[PDB]
Every structure is written in structure tokens, then in C-alpha cells.
Amino acid sequence: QKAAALVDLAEDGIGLPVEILDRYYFIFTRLDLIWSLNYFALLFLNFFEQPLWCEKNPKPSCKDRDYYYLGELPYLTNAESIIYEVITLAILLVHTFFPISYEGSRIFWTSRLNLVKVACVVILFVDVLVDFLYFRIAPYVRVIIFILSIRELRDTLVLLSGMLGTYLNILALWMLFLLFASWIAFVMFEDTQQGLTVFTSYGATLYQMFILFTTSNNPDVWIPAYKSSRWSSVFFVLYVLIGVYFVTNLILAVVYDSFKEQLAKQVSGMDQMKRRMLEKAFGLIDSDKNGEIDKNQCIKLFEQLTNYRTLPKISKEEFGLIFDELDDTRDFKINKDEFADLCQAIALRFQKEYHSALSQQLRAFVRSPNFGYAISFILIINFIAVVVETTLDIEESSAQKPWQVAEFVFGWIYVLEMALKIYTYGFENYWREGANRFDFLVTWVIVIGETATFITPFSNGEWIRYLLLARMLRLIRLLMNVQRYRAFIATFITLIPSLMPYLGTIFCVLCIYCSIGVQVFGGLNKKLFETELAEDDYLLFNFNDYPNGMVTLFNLLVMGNWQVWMESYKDLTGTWWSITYFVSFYVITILLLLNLVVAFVLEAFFTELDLEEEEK
Amino acid sequence: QKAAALVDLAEDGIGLPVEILDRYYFIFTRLDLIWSLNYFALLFLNFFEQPLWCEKNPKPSCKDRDYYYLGELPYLTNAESIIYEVITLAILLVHTFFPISYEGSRIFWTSRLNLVKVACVVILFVDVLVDFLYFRIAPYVRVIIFILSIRELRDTLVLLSGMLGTYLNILALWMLFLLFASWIAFVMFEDTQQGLTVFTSYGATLYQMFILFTTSNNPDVWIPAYKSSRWSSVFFVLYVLIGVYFVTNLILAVVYDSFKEQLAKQVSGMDQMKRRMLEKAFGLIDSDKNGEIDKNQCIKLFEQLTNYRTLPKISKEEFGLIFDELDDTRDFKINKDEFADLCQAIALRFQKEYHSALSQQLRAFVRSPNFGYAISFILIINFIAVVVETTLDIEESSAQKPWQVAEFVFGWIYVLEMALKIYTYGFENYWREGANRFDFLVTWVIVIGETATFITPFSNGEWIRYLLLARMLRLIRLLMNVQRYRAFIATFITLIPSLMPYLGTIFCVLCIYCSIGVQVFGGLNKKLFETELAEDDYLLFNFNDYPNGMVTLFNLLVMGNWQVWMESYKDLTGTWWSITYFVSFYVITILLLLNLVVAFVLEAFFTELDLEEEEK
Ligand SMILES: [Ba+2]
Ligand SMILES: [Ba+2]
Ligand SMILES: [Ba+2]
Ligand SMILES: [Ba+2]
Ligand SMILES: [Ba+2]
Ligand SMILES: [Ba+2]
Ligand SMILES: [Ba+2]
Ligand SMILES: [Ba+2]
Ligand SMILES: [Ba+2]
Ligand SMILES: [Ba+2]
Ligand SMILES: [Ba+2]
Ligand SMILES: [Ba+2]
Ligand SMILES: [Ba+2]
Ligand SMILES: [Ba+2]
Ligand SMILES: [Ca+2]
Ligand SMILES: [Ca+2]
Ligand SMILES: [Ca+2]
Ligand SMILES: [Ca+2]
């Protein structure tokens, strides 16, 4: 009946899942709940197509492919590129044809998102056939399509814009600070030592003061001036003090507040949609369209929410006397708004979510705490076994087999545990809790490890087995029982998945800034390449290939000696208008995104503290 | 009368100033309000006695004093040390004898603070006479005496302890993280490349992973492992990601919350004392000790608070009808608690604080906005004049006199402004607003500059004049009229004095960590000193002298290539138990104090936003 349809709607809205219509929509979404899973791997592989792709560097140039400090394995032949791109674009084409099913023809192409999706698809197609028969913006539309493909990154982008609004203003003020400070600094050391300051007039001093602002060149950049006079330092310290602890911090504060504001905006935009779900449910169960529901119409919805969703109580005549007790007046009173708060309160404060003989013997013992204690002690002896095997491999006193085979059969004990636990709990019930999913993937990489190690053909054993000691990382959850380190560990655990859309966003930003590196900074040998610098002759073993560009972009992201990539390339291309790359990168990923994730970590920790204080 | 005494008490308690008694106390505190000013300069000079003092390095050793990359001017002869220390200790002795006057004999020596003060004094004495007739902990008791000398740093220390409590716990968890990560990393690269990892077994890997945790060696420390295999990076990035953005951030969060808590505790401890002041006032004006005050006893206190403190209204029979209106019932009703809220509300929402012919002509025109506009335009043309003089000095096309003499007479216009403004407003009224004090000190360094430049005897002109263009920094206050950059600038302005006790605290911490450097790391030439490192042969132009040790401590504080001081000294002394210095420093001044000031900047900015939102 319509009532049951409601129960599904209320339970789904409670689970925060929802559609966007108003039985085609139903059955089509049901067809989507499986296709989305393959679509995820599709998007991830299509994204990984970009780093595995060939480059524009070996393209009509000599003499590829050798090792002029450029490249790491592997690459892609143009044919494999063709077929792979064709496959991914085909499944993607299906993934773009599919949402038109549970939508109107004039409705689908009307949304700002879908038309952009299709546009990126036809761009990727008009580029895949051309790239086949024959390449610039081709990798860009891949990461672009990917970012908007997943809503949990789309919302993040909306957020980021919503704060970049004022972030531009605080950036302008920062720019003013830089300009003035650089001017005063330049006019301070004009007709004295040294040459590194005066070398390229004012612009050089602005450049170097900007690099001093990130403190990635602090001891050195004013070292000659300090050698001249010691009191010179009194300037620079004052510049750092006022620069890093005063300015940068309140920049972080600006990004903080802006983020919090836009986030409150986002969840405010979420509650409205959820309310739309609940009001849809009530609107459907209210056949008379009076705006209210009666007990003879309410206890059935309650009963359905009991039988199909959560567990409250039992409905009898006692229930009738209960409804007759709340007012000693009748009948009956529940409206469109009280119903929502009732559903929310029930879903919140109350509970949530073959022969029955041979299986029920284990289905009652696996739910017992004895099983958890079993796998606990198992991962303990697993720990001591692993640390022994490893501590004997480092002493080369092996005697490696009797322990590593034991860790293999430990992996077998883990796949046994995983199998019986995924069997006794459920197909989707075991998949709901994320920890069990982590254990699921760890196990399912352990077994493909077993296929790769035992079936077809040592050191590979040590490698592909010791890495999966992260299965024993769940033993650290024990520390939450201590009121000293509870909030910390809990915050971390809740941070692992919640910080993921931001990390993924900035990762995609890196994947966007890498294509720029391949397209512009292809050429790395030469006279310039060997001239400067010292460790830069070692540090520049990258940014020529794509994974190299990615990991050196990481090296920029940690701000560890980052400027050595900025300057060594500056005099590698010749033009100063190359550094505009680096700066931009910084000002996009250091003063914005990293401050954002700092803000989010802080806010998450405070939320955890407020939760622990709430339950007190 | 007693009532007037109250008015002074309520006004002082409102101004947050207070004593600690219960007319000796009165007159003695009045004698203190002037002595404290000299005591400040006394404490500052006594503190500056430490960096100007001699060292333990030239003490019975050869061959001082040359330039073996050790030392900057100036120093102190032992005789000058004797007389200076004697003077400072004498005035300090007076400053310790003085508080015993307005206190009880059995009361003074009973307080935990005073006895420690006197103890430090007699230590400084039993050390000054010995150091005279002849030196280890002598500089320590100076900074120690100084920190507790000023309450505004004492409270900061209390705060710091109150948070270091749990900060120890989060530090322990961090230690665990380091240990485990270092172990797994070490066992990852055991029987492969390279040597930098295995060199000193596990401890070396813990050391290097710890230096990777501060990201001050990120590209390099795993560079050989990356040269071996590219996939090795996949480890380290995961270590940095999980290390810097997950751990360090919630460490900052811990310090944040702890700080906020202890601060709320502190201001809570402040309001209690203020309430004690107000309750003292009411308790004194309530002669009958009934706990309440009548209108015929209240309008006189009101009248006194009008005539001597702030400005409300006028008291007539209309006032009597007003009191007869609030209830149409009498008489009369004000108790000990309502009086406090009344005083607070009046002091908050309402206002706050020779022939009268020749002077009153200027005393009415200086208060006009035309004067502010005058000095504004004056500092504008001052700006263009200064930028012209400076931009012609850098072109060596001078023609320097006609502009620099104009900036001198500009300084004269500023001392004229300062004189007439300090004359027309008041002796202490001009001193209340901090901005006018900044202008006062700028002016009063400009005039001693005039004494040093014009009276006794160029480039010295340029130097000692261009530096005081910070008098034109008040032109940046104009930006607050823009609703884009208002909160930022305002926050900064309010941060300049409020962040000062923390900066002073960490500065004193540096001054404590410097004596350790002089006493332990005296010896810097040698074989070790020239061996490592490259830029470290240039970077180690310090930490031998005291100001050198201070500025290189600054170089450590900014975490710019800090580890090069840590390692170069490690193999300069030989023992690893020297690095325990550096680490400690870090873990005291980077994970605690700097996170504290970050938290404080953020909190200040948020407070500013809440204020601007409040007035909306
Ligand atoms: Ba010059
Ligand atoms: Ba000059
Ligand atoms: Ba250089
Ligand atoms: Ba930082
Ligand atoms: Ba109605
Ligand atoms: Ba459970
Ligand atoms: Ba619990
Ligand atoms: Ba170097
Ligand atoms: Ba080995
Ligand atoms: Ba091995
Ligand atoms: Ba090395
Ligand atoms: Ba009473
Ligand atoms: Ba005023
Ligand atoms: Ba105003
Ligand atoms: Ca292709
Ligand atoms: Ca109805
Ligand atoms: Ca002395
Ligand atoms: Ca009374």
C-alpha cells in the first residue's frame, strides 16, 4: 500500500538517502543501486588512465625513450590507449544514458549538471576518436568529469567557491602586505650589501620576500645581510614575527570562518531536502489531504516502521489506552510537522535496523563477545609473530619460513573469519559498518596475494604479507577506553572518512596541476640542468614524467624546500612568467585547501569533545 | 567621606585595577604608581644585562678574543658587570622592600610569590658578590625573576601549565605514533637500499622519521629510497598525509581547547575579584550593614560617580519622580547584587571618563576633526616625500638634502603635534589611548634622533629617519571603513597588544634556552666544523655568542632548515644526548607555544567577528 511506500521513504530520508522526482523512478533507481558500484571502478580506472597515459614530451622529439633524468615505468601505447579509452567512454556513455530513464526528456537536459556531464562526454569522444586517428585538454576533462561525477566532491567544490569569495579579499590584503614589506626591505638594503638583494631590482626583493613569507628560505635569504651587520636580523625577525604568526594565522582564521559558514549553509540545505522527503511521505499517507493523521491511520505506519525498519514496542489495546492517556481526549491528533519530529526522534533515540538449523549454531556464537575476543587474541599472537619474523629478517638469521607460513595461515584465519562473519550477519549488513569493509578489502587483497604467491610460483612473501599488518590496527581502538586518549583516537577515526572529500579534492587539484607540468615543463642533459642546483641535481629526478610530477607536487604540498623547484625551473625556461605557475599552486593549495582541512580537523575534534560532553 | 572612597573603588574595579587588602595601603599604592614605571625600565635593563654579559667560553681558554666564527659586538668587562648588577640589584631590592609596606609582616612573607621573589633576589646577591670577587645559574634567575615580576606573564605561565597537563598526554600519544611509524619504516627498508636508513640501526630511523614529522627534511630523507623504487614514495606520502594533516592538526586542536578552557578559567577568576571589589564598595557604603541601599543614600553615590568619573545625567526633583515611577512604591530598593549590575551597566553602556583663555583657543580646535584631517594630510605628503627621497637615494641621483631636510622638519611637525596634543588633552589622558603612546614613543625617538644627528655632528640621516615612517602606519586604519577588510585590520590591531604576553613568554623561553647554549655548546677552527655541512659552514655563524644564539634560536623557531643546527652540533659534541636539547626545544616551543598563539589569533578574530555581528 501507499503506507509501506511511506515507510521506505521515511527510513530512506532518515538514512539521508533520497531521489529527485515529483513506478519508473523506483525500478530505475533500483537498477542504479548496482550499476553505481561498477561506475565507481569505471571512474577510478578512467582517472588512472591519465597518469598511465603517454606524454607530449616523447611526441615528435629526440631521443625518446632513454634516461635523461626523465621518466618512470610504465607507459601506454597509443593502441591500448585507444581501446581502453573507448571502453571507459562506452561504460561512461551508458552511465550518462541511464539517468535520463528516471527523468523527463525535457527535465534531464535542463539541469546545469547533466548537460555539462554530456558535454564533457562528447568532448572526450570527439577527442578520443581524433586522438585515435592521429591531446591537450583531453586529460583535463577526465579529472573534471570525475570531480562532478561524485556528489561528495561536488558539494566540496560548492563550499570551496563559497569561501573563495572572501578568500580573494584576504588574498588582496596579503598581496598589499607583501608589496609594502618588500618595498621597505628593498629600500633598506639599497646602497649596501649585498648583491642577492639588488640583483634584479625590486621584483627580486618581492620574490625573495614572498619566499621568506613561506619561511622556506628564512636562514639563507638574509644571511649575507646578517654577515654584513648583525642588527639587520632585527628587521627580518620582525618581518617573520609579524608575517607568519600575525598574518598567516588570521588568514587561516578567515578560511576557517568562511568554511564553517558555507558548511552550515550546506547542512541547512540538507535538512530542507530531508524535510521534503518526510513531508512527501506524510503527504502520501494523508489520503484525505487534511494535513493530519489519525491513530487508526498512525498505528499502521508505526507498525510498518516496526516490522520493516527499526524496533520499538508491540501494539495492543494497551497502546490504545496509551494514546487515550496522552490527553484523555480524542480524536486523533498528529499533523504534518509533529510527524516529522516524531520520525526523527524515533530513528535517533531508539534502535536502528536455507535451513535455520545448521547455520543457526554459528549465527548465535559469532554474535557473542567470545568471537570478538577470539579474533582479538588471534591478532595479538599475530602481532608478536609478525614482529618476530620481521626482527629476524633484519638480523638475517632466518629461519624465516616457520613464522611467515604462520602469518600466511594467519591470513587464512582472517579470510575464514571474514567468510563466516559475512555469512552470519548479511550480504549488506556486514557492508554497512565501514570497519568491516576495511577488513573485507584487507582480506580480499590478502587472498589475491595468496593467488599471486602460492598458486603461480620468499621476499615477495615478506613484502606482500607484512604490509597487511594494518589488519591489527583495530587493536588501537582499545585506547578509547581510557579517558585520557579517548577523544584523540575517536576524533582520528571519525576524521579518516570525513576528511576524505577534501583530500580527494586537493588530490584532483594536484592531478590538474600535473597536466600543466607535462604540457609546459616537458623539457628538463643541458647546461642549465647541470648548473643549478646542488641537491637540485638530485631533487630534479622528477616533474618530467606524470607520477614524478605528482610526487614532486606532493613535495611542493608539504612545502619542504619547494622553492628549489620554482627557481630551478625559472631559469630552465628563462621567463619569470613561469613562476606564476608555482605561486598560483601555492596560493590555491596552501593558503586555501590546507587551511580548510586544518579548520575541519579542529572542528571535528571540537565536535567530538562536545559529543563526549553531551553523553556525560 | 566613605561614599567617595567607594566611587574610587567602583571606578577602579570597573577599570579592572585593584589591590589586595582587608590609609597605609592607599598612600603606599599611590607611592607605587610612580615607582612601577621606573621598575619596568629596571627589569628590562636587568634582563638586557644577560645578552650584554660576558660568556663562559672566553673564560680560562685560548685564544680569546678573535674571530673563529664566534662572536658579535659588544661585550662586558667584569667591573662594569659588577657595578651594573649592583645598581639593578639595589633598585630591585628597593622594589622588594616596597611591597612589604602596604602588607602585613606575617602576611608578606607568607605569600608563595613574594618569598620566591626575595629568594631569587638573595640568590642574585649571593651570586653578584661571588661573581664580583671571582656564574652558572646567574642569568637564569634574571629571566626567572623577570617573568614573575610582571603579572601579565605570570597569568600566562599559569595558563601554560594548566594546559601542559593534558598536553603531556597528547605528547605521549604522539610519541607512540613516532615509535611505531619509525619501526615499520625501518623494517620496510632493512635488507635493501639504502645506507642512510640502516646506518645507525633503528634509532637513526626514529630520528630521521622524527625530522620527517616536522617536514624539514621531506624531499631528501627518502630520496635514495625513491631512487631505488618509485613506489617507495607511496609509503612516505601516506606517512606525511597521516602525520602532518591528521596528527599535528589535532595536536593543535588539543592545545586550542586546553587554552580556551584555561582562559575561561582565568577570566572566571577575574570576575570574582572584580565582584569582590564592587562588594567591597557596597559593603563600605552600607553603614547599617543591612545589605541594601536607599535612594537618599544612592543618589549621592550616583552624583559622585557623575562628578568624578563618568557622565550620565543631572539630579533634580525629576529624578525623585523617576525613582517614584519605577514602582509607584517606596522605599527604597537596591541591594548588594543589583548595585553591581547597575555599576557594570552604567560603566559599560554609558560614557567613560593656568589661565583658561590663551590655552582654550587651541583646546577647542585640537578636539575638532580638522586637526585629525590636518595631521592626516600631513602624513600623506610625508608619505610621498619619503618615497621620493628613498626612490632617489636608490638611483643615486641625489639631490638628497632638499627632501630629507623636509622629512626632518616633518619630524619637527610631529613633535609639535605631539606637544600641543599632550598639552591640550592631559598628562595621563593622552597616555591612556595606546595609539597616542605609540606616536609618543616614535616622536620621542625622533627627537633623540635629532639630538644625535643635528647637535653633535647624511647616511645616518636616511637610516634613523626613514625607519620612523611607521608614524604613517596609522593611515592603514582607514581600511576599516571598508566592510571587506574591516574585521581583518581590526583583528590585527587588537592582536598587537593582546598577543604580547604570549610573545614575551616564548621570548623568555628563548632567553632560557640561550643560556643552555652558552653553557653547553660553547666550543664551535676544527675538523668537524669544516667537514659538515655545506651551507652549514655558512649557517653556523652563530650560537657561539649570546645574540647569535638568540637569532639562531629564532631560526629554529621558524623551523627553517632547523635540523642542520641539530645534527651539525650532534657530531660536534659527539654524543646523541645533545639532540635532546633541540627536540626538547621543539616540543616546548613548536607544539605548545606556537599552537597556543595560533589558537589565540583564531579566537581573537572570531571574537572580532562576533563583535561586529553584535553591533549589527
Ligand atoms: Ba644601489
Ligand atoms: Ba644611501
Ligand atoms: Ba642563492
Ligand atoms: Ba603550519
Ligand atoms: Ba489544516
Ligand atoms: Ba554491534
Ligand atoms: Ba562505549
Ligand atoms: Ba643545500
Ligand atoms: Ba640489512
Ligand atoms: Ba628481507
Ligand atoms: Ba645526508
Ligand atoms: Ba538581608
Ligand atoms: Ba575620541
Ligand atoms: Ba565606527
Ligand atoms: Ca588516448
Ligand atoms: Ca488525514
Ligand atoms: Ca656579573
Ligand atoms: Ca543600608
Swiss-Prot record, chains A, B:
It is found in: Vacuole membrane. PROSITE patterns: EF_HAND_2. Pfam families: Ion_trans (PF00520). The chain crosses the membrane at residues 33-53, 82-102, 120-134, 135-150, 170-190, 234-254, 368-388, 405-425, 438-457, 463-480, 492-512, 582-602. One of its GO terms (cellular component) is plant-type vacuole. It comes from the Eukaryota. Ubiquitously expressed. Disruption phenotype: Plants display an impairment of both the Ca(2+) inhibition of stomatal guard cell opening and abscisic acid (ABA) inhibition of seed germination. Functions as a voltage-gated inward-rectifying Ca(2+) channel (VDCC) across the vacuole membrane. Is one of the essential components of the slow vacuolar (SV) channel. Acts as the major ROS-responsive Ca(2+) channel and is the possible target of Al-dependent inhibition. Involved in the regulation of germination and stomatal movement. Each of the two internal repeats contains five hydrophobic transmembrane segments (S1, S2, S3, S5, S6) and one positively charged transmembrane segment (S4). S4 segments probably represent the voltage-sensor and are characterized by a series of positively charged amino acids. Belongs to the calcium channel alpha-1 subunit (TC 1.A.1.11) family. Two pore calcium channel subfamily. This is Two pore calcium channel protein 1. The lineage of its organism: Eukaryota, Viridiplantae, Streptophyta, Embryophyta, Tracheophyta. The gene is TPC1.
